[PDB]
RNA sequence: AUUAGGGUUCGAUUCCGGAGAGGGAGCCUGAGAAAUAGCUACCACUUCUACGGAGGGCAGCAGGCGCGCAAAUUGCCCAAUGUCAAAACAAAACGAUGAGGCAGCGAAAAGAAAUAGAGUUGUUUCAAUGGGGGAUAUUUAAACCCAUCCCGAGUAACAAUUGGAGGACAAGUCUGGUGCCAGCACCCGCGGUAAUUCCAGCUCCAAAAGCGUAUAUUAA
């Protein structure tokens, strides 16, 4: 044996990050969130059920 | 740009030939902190002392946004009094104190080897 | 009808609970010294060891899997262990006659998971992390 | 070595991380007064819980005694002076009511807010960080100043800001530095 | 330290008491020592020498070697606090002090706190400020830090991380790869060609200048 050690890590195709543009740390991040949640069965992230 | 002066605390010293305050200056609207030798000139004036070197302010400390500081003055009588009564770091500052001796390493190396020697040649 | 309750009782009481607490398992563990002398490390948290080789363990049922591990000699006492390798590839990094950290499992002694046996886990090789080189954040020297 | 300067915690983290009901609440609290994070409401916990823990205690002896007329009037003082509780509470049993908003509201931040110096509560944040805002014609920057009843009446601008007596701002000079160069 | 109460556990370490100066004995001086930067001998180590001989004791402060999972600069000063003393200070004319103080290194731990804000139409403006760079100066024994004051923000590139997303436990029937292999998993359990759990991308969740892991210990 010993010989499958990294099989799967090596074999997984290369995809690179996207880059988006940064975010408001700090304090405002916490105001982002409150008013996203809160004034405009409470669902967080929902994916496209059109899959299945 | 003006310069405002109060003494708080005043005491007459019989002995050490002098008199202590504390120092508050007010100076609204003014660029930065306000040097030791103008306090001194405005000191000498309101208490009229003949000499402005028989006045000695310590440390100052500026207050958390501006247009106060608050520090410590000395007045003594005469000015052979002032030079024979205060310390040396303070006349040094004033202009006129004992220029530094060597480093104190040296002097620690050359005494140890002076316990070695007894005679007149140590 | 378990116990005594008389005013001035108390030397019964204090001699029932003395002898009573060493049927407490855990207890009667931090009290004696025989799991300390039982323990490869001396009572510490990490250890240090040369590698002798390298091995696989297969994985207890209903799992299936070969884990890799490596056998350690520890510096301190000269006392051998099989510590298991964490993460996708990672053997790699880990060559024989080096030096590397040794830490516990996680169960205080007790066996974890479906590794039969194993109660150690490497954590650094050749004064560098582990996982830091599994993240490609630092390089191996030498 | 041979330093006996004292120091201690002002906060502490709540048993049970992942309760949905305790965070739904808090996230409600933070972006009502603008807070940073999670911590400024724990100390404001921690300041609550250490009042009504002195509460019982004194609830428990009897009245009349030494260490309840002493100690009962001072806290119901403190209270009062802070604006906690309003004068017409005087029982030493109104202090067991008293919940985290009751003490947020007496902030800086929100103080300035609700005066009218600023348009939100973020907006309130940066002016106190900025040197703007002055109480008694002291400068105070930190958020969490807790306004007593008292020197309500004296806050307003401070005199060495733009937006009091003070000279022209950054802007407005690199403005005219550039005007004079050209 | 933790704890409704009763309790459990830690205390080499700043103040008080005791004991020791490689090990073990013995002693002189002295008001006071069985003293160790005093003496005498033996044991174990160890330095110089012209070979006749002569020396050594960091569990003081810095440093070095080993040991280990595991812990700073061979720095400045007696300005403050004290101690000794033949001694106020000053005047030809400055007592010593690794006690002690000051700075350097230092995510053990503890406070306060940036990483924006306000607006107009269906993307375009407006002020404000720190980090930073300097000061007639201030501080300091001398320096340094803080405080005070000006030339300076628009990817304000002056660009926030660490763990997770079946259950306990907040958060995806998403999209590729692998195919009881590789691997995950504190526990229950995933993976055998349509993986809510592995390797990745995207999007979300928690705490946040912090967040994981190991080993002890208190509550549970
Ligand atoms: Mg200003
Ligand atoms: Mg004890
Ligand atoms: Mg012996
Ligand atoms: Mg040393
Ligand atoms: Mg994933
Ligand atoms: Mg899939």
Redesign the interface.
């Given at each position: 044996s010993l010989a499958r050690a990294g099989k799967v890590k090596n074999q997984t195709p290369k995809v690179a990050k996207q880059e988006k543009p940064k975010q408001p740390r700090g304090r405002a991040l916490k105001r982002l969130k409150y008013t996203r949640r809160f004034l405009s069965k409470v669902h967080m992230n929902k994916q496209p059920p059109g899959k299945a | 740009a003006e310069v405002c002066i109060r003494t708080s605390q005043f005491k007459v010293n019989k002995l050490l030939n002098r008199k202590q305050f504390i120092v508050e200056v007010n100076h609204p609207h003014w660029c930065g902190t306000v040097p030791t030798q103008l306090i001194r000139k405005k000191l000498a004036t309101l208490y009229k002392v003949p000499d402005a070197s028989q006045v000695s302010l310590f440390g100052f400390k500026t207050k958390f946004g501006g247009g106060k500081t608050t520090g410590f003055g000395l007045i003594y009588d005469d000015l052979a009094s002032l030079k024979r009564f205060e310390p040396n770091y303070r006349k040094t500052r004033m202009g006129f104190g004992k220029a530094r001796l060597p480093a104190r390493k040296s002097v620690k190396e050359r005494r140890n080897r002076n316990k070695k020697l007894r005679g007149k040649a140590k | 009808m378990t116990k005594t309750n008389g005013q001035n009782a108390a030397r019964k009481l204090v001699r029932l609970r003395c002898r009573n607490r060493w049927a407490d398992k855990g207890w009667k563990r931090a009290h004696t010294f025989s799991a300390r002398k039982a323990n490869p490390f001396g009572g510490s948290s990490h250890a240090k060891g040369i590698v002798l080789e390298?091995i696989?363990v297969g994985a207890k049922q209903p799992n299936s899997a070969?884990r890799?591990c490596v056998r350690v000699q520890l510096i301190k006492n000269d006392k051998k262990i099989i510590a298991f390798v964490p993460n996708?590839?990672?053997?790699?990094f880990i060559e024989e006659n080096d030096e590397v950290l040794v830490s516990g499992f996680g169960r205080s002694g007790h066996a974890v998971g479906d590794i039969p046996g194993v109660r150690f886990k490497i954590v650094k090789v050749s004064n560098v992390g582990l996982y830091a080189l599994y993240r490609q954040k630092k390089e191996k020297p030498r | 070595m041979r330093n006996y300067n004292n120091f201690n915690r002002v906060w502490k983290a709540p048993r049970r991380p992942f309760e949905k009901e305790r965070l739904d609440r808090e996230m409600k609290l933070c972006g009502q007064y603008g807070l940073r994070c999670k911590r400024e409401i724990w100390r404001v916990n921690m300041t609550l819980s250490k009042m009504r823990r002195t509460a019982r205690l004194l609830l428990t002896l009897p009245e009349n005694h030494p260490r309840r007329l002493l100690e009962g009037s001072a806290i119901m003082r403190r209270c009062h002076e802070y604006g906690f509780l309003d004068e017409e509470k005087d029982k030493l049993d109104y202090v067991l009511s008293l919940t985290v908003p009751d003490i947020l509201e007496r902030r800086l931040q929100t103080i300035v807010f609700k005066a009218g110096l600023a348009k939100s509560v973020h907006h309130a944040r940066v002016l106190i960080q900025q040197r703007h805002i002055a109480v008694a014609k002291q400068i105070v920057t930190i958020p969490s100043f807790i306004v007593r009843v008292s020197s309500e009446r004296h806050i307003a601008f401070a005199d060495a800001s733009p937006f009091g007596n003070g000279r022209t701002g950054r802007v407005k000079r690199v403005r005219a530095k550039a005007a004079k160069r050209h």
């Open positions: - | - | 390298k696989g070969i890799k996708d590839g990672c053997l790699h | -």
